[PDB]
Design a protein around this ligand. Structure first.
Ligand SMILES: Nc1nc2c(ncn2[C@@H]2O[C@H](COP(=O)(O)OP(=O)(O)O)[C@@H](O)[C@H]2O)c(=O)[nH]1
Ligand SMILES: Nc1nc2c(ncn2[C@@H]2O[C@H](COP(=O)(O)OP(=O)(O)O)[C@@H](O)[C@H]2O)c(=O)[nH]1
Lengths: 474, 474
């Protein structure tokens, strides 16, 4: 049971021993790779990923075949890093952002005015083709010696990988995990033909394609029927038959890593002290929907009873170079700016720093939590925030978040495009009693706790194992 | 077989006899109502619709119970017009435009920034509730005397109608026709809850819900499964079982009315003379996608071989008051303006007049025709233009147009968001030979000709009849 895990980034920390002065390379826990190395069947694991630092590039060239790295139980994993054509790599990264692929899987486009694919998409795809050849090659190269390689393929960047893997090792078990949603067939279809088909041609040769949510899987299967005449779907069995490949689609939900007291960001406590605090947290991504959250807070305050309540928009900076992240951050400032002009000043604050620790302090402080994403593959903060909060905070969750399948019954679920509803739910949550809240919180945690990172990985290993036996038999 | 047809508008022409001076009211042919009165089973027909003129209002109040009107074979139909609360009526009309309902069925929204439903949607819905009560009431009132009323309900405005009809006449056959697309379940779901459910609650009590395209039906059924736990779908049988109603979904495609030589618009012939002419035609709606057509013409001309080719954007003014129609018209001018600055001047012209006759002349003149809508319930011009053209013009059709199910094999079909493809198809069509074109044209017409308006109506009558027998039996 020799395992080869491929990820877009493998999280490595590069630093100097604070005594030695010697440069250190280590892996950060949880981990995925770290965690896989921890399970029952696993004999060995190798992790393969792209280089994005020059720390990466520099440490890569010193060990082309990979560097063996050690964590728990004196275990080890072999970490191989790929140095791509820098021009090629940089282009594919823009291919995966809101400029192209991120809008497609995450419902960015309006159809009426976006998108308008030109030459750039052709060139981006070609490059994605090239970038995929690297990974497949690097992974294969790494597995030449192994007898029975089990391949785990992660991140959306690696979609075209399994085909090129099944090309060379046809009996091998291949799982592709996609952490992001899958668009409806009409939406998936917006993509240029060579792109809407090519992604599906790359994905299907896998033993399993794992998603976070049932809705993602179904959407995927609908696309296949829509776009591949040769493919047969079973909506019940979650299978696809195409070109002699049998593919199973599983939903393997994720919640949190428990292997993860922090201070609030500057002045936030004094700012918050004496007020109930509404918190919204996310990356600087358009999907996270903080603008509507801010407006909805405003429609609520107008309702009354939102005296002495404050709202914190916790944001995490990410990929600000993409216009959509930029616009979205700007679009939120305007909202916040207006909410303060209408309802009082310093009623709302934004924090845009990149501390993980600062967010967890925010989760703990919060009296109401909002995770009303327009869409979310899963959203793991929505599991995380309830589990660390001792204020018995209610959660407003979007129904378009994958976590909703797991946590929607036990949270306040709203259509993420309705301000009237979202507002109503804000005041509803803050009208609600301590004891009503105290019991709904305990139950919310009971539903959230089981989905640890570890279990998610066992699902993958157990799930691929079973599906492998099936493909092998069929 | 007493028939009662309900439409949003019943097309009446109000004028003075050019001898008498007496004010005249007549119905324009084809007609629908006119055409129904023409079929085998029909004993009598009554047509019920909203008043939008003051011509309407004025002629309505003179005959509250309806005015009997005469066309063919000295036949007659009884035409009843509804005067609604003008404030109520005006609000629902804004409810059906790109501001709300049109964006929902026609993929207007971007999700990231639109839509943001507030109080206006609540108030619009309430009003739609009121507006539907009128129609149901007016229709019912009209049918009090009849033994076995067959009800035909048309236009998207009348969706909530059949429920209120099935409320009062539970054994009656009810067909609802929707001329517009149906959005994917994730897209349909953007609507506020009371709206995404309420429309489905209104529609289902029908014997049949007829769509123009299979894709519409499927999308509808997916919404039901997504939004009504009580409902059971059969994707194969195109049925829904909900609350004791059995509903069948049929696809009943429409092409054209043959019961419909005109001059070109001003200067167009002299402008066109000596050049091949590219034509795009539609209403001033965002879905019609003339901007991308213009750009795609531009990517083509850059290709070469587009010397001495001109492009005419035929537009029909409609509902310019809605921002989207406005923006779209502006967005096109910019495109056209730029295409002329780059490739030569007066290479591209726009016509925005409201003559039907001017468009048919344009269809006849055209050497290449473009109907690359972003989405279209059907699009009947795409059937119409090939059938009147004697230049053997190729058609570029969008694959998101319903007519594609009928005409996609015999046209050049493109993803409507890909300029590179659309461009390629432009030059491909104009590279193509006279004889290649001459034969593909004859075949295109063979596929288009059968779908007359009349047949579409027989489909409805025959289709409801059969479905009625079934619901009656089940
Ligand atoms: N780097 C960083 N991570 C954070 C921050 N705040 C929270 N996190 C963690 O980053 C992850 C974000 O969760 P999730 O919603 O699933 O991420 P998403 O893919 O961007 O939607 C969670 O584990 C958070 O606890 C921050 O400010 N910076
Ligand atoms: N009133 C009007 N009708 C037109 C014009 N040009 C074409 N038409 C007719 O209007 C109908 C428009 O066809 P269709 O694409 O199915 O309409 P859509 O619902 O707006 O997409 C066709 O019968 C055309 O022949 C025009 O300039 N004004």
């Amino acid at each position: 049971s020799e395992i080869f895990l491929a990820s877009k980034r493998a999280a490595i920390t590069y630093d100097t021993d604070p005594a030695t002065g010697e440069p250190r390379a280590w892996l950060a826990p949880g981990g995925t790779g770290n965690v896989v190395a921890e399970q029952a069947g696993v004999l060995n694991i190798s992790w393969i990923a792209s280089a994005d630092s020059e720390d990466d590039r520099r440490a890569s060239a010193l060990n082309p075949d990979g560097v063996t790295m050690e964590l728990h139980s004196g275990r080890e994993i072999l970490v191989r890093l790929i140095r791509h054509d820098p021009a090629v790599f940089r282009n594919v990264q823009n291919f995966m952002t809101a400029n192209l692929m991120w809008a497609a899987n995450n419902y960015g486009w309006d159809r009426w005015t976006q998108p308008s694919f030109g030459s750039d998409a052709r060139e981006g795809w070609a490059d994605f083709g090239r970038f995929t050849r690297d990974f497949a090659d690097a992974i294969l190269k790494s597995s030449a010696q192994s007898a029975d390689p089990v391949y785990l393929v992660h991140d959306y960047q690696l979609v075209g990988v399994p085909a090129l893997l099944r090309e060379q090792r046809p009996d091998a078990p291949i799982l592709l995990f996609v952490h992001i949603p899958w668009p409806s067939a009409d939406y998936w279809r917006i993509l240029p033909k060579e792109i809407r088909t090519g992604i599906l041609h790359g994905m299907l040769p896998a033993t399993t394609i794992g998603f976070f949510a049932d809705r993602w899987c179904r959407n995927f299967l609908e696309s296949v029927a829509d776009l591949l005449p040769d493919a047969r779907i079973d909506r019940e069995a979650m299978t696809v038959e195409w070109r002699g490949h049998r593919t199973r689609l599983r939903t393997m939900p994720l919640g949190y890593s428990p292997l993860t007291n922090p201070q609030l960001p500057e002045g936030i406590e004094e700012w918050a002290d004496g007020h109930r605090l509404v918190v919204h947290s996310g990356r600087t991504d358009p999907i996270k929907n903080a603008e509507r959250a801010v407006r909805a807070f405003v429609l609520a305050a107008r309702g009354g009873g939102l005296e002495k309540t404050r709202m914190l928009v916790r944001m995490n900076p990410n990929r600000l170079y993409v216009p959509a992240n930029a616009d979205y951050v700007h679009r939120v400032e305007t909202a916040v700016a207006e909410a303060n002009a209408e309802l009082g000043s310093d009623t709302v604050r934004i924090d845009n720093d990149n501390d993980v620790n600062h967010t967890i302090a925010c989760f703990r402080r919060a009296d109401l939590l909002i995770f009303n994403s327009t869409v979310d593959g899963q959203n793991l903060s929505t599991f995380e925030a309830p589990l660390v909060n001792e204020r018995d905070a209610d959660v407003i969750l979007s129904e378009t978040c994958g976590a909703a399948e797991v946590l929607g019954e036990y949270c306040r679920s709203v259509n993420p495009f309705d301000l009237v509803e979202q507002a109503e739910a804000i005041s509803a949550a803050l009208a609600a009693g301590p004891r009503q809240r105290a019991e709904a919180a305990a139950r919310r945690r009971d539903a959230a706790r089981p989905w640890t990172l570890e279990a998610w990985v066992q699902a993958q290993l157990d799930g691929l194992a079973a599906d492998h036996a099936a493909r092998t038999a069929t």
